[PDB]
Write a protein that binds this ligand. Structure first.
Ligand SMILES: [Zn+2]
Ligand SMILES: [Zn+2]
Ligand SMILES: [Zn+2]
Ligand SMILES: [Zn+2]
Length: 114
């Protein structure tokens, strides 16, 4: 089509004109009114995702209006609705359960438990 695609390895961005593609190749932010410049294309791509508030993945639980960027975040969230606590501590006199793996990992660090 009329769009100008970026040819940098891994990049999926496209632009209305060659002008904006050239500015993109100079690692200038694509967002109107930002103007920030970056040392590499890696730094540029990391930055522009901060401007995004797009959360494409909706919670499937009826009544819930929450939305998510990543599938793992949505999957973890659904456990709040189901009450699932998949991670159980292995120590003899603890028996503590966790909803998210990061909470289970935090418990193993803070207290010396299996
Ligand atoms: Zn690019
Ligand atoms: Zn920016
Ligand atoms: Zn939900
Ligand atoms: Zn424990």
């Amino acid at each position: 089509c009329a769009a100008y695609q970026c040819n940098m390895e891994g990049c999926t961005m496209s632009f209305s004109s060659e002008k904006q593609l050239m500015l993109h190749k100079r690692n200038i932010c694509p967002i109107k009114g930002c103007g920030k410049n970056f040392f590499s294309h890696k730094y540029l791509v990391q930055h522009q995702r901060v401007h995004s508030d797009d959360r494409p993945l909706k919670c499937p639980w009826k009544g819930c209006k929450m939305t998510f960027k990543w599938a793992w975040s949505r999957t973890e969230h659904i456990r709040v609705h189901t009450g699932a606590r998949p991670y159980v501590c292995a120590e003899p006199d603890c028996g503590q359960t966790f909803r998210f793996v990061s909470d289970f990992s935090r418990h193993k660090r803070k207290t010396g438990h299996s």
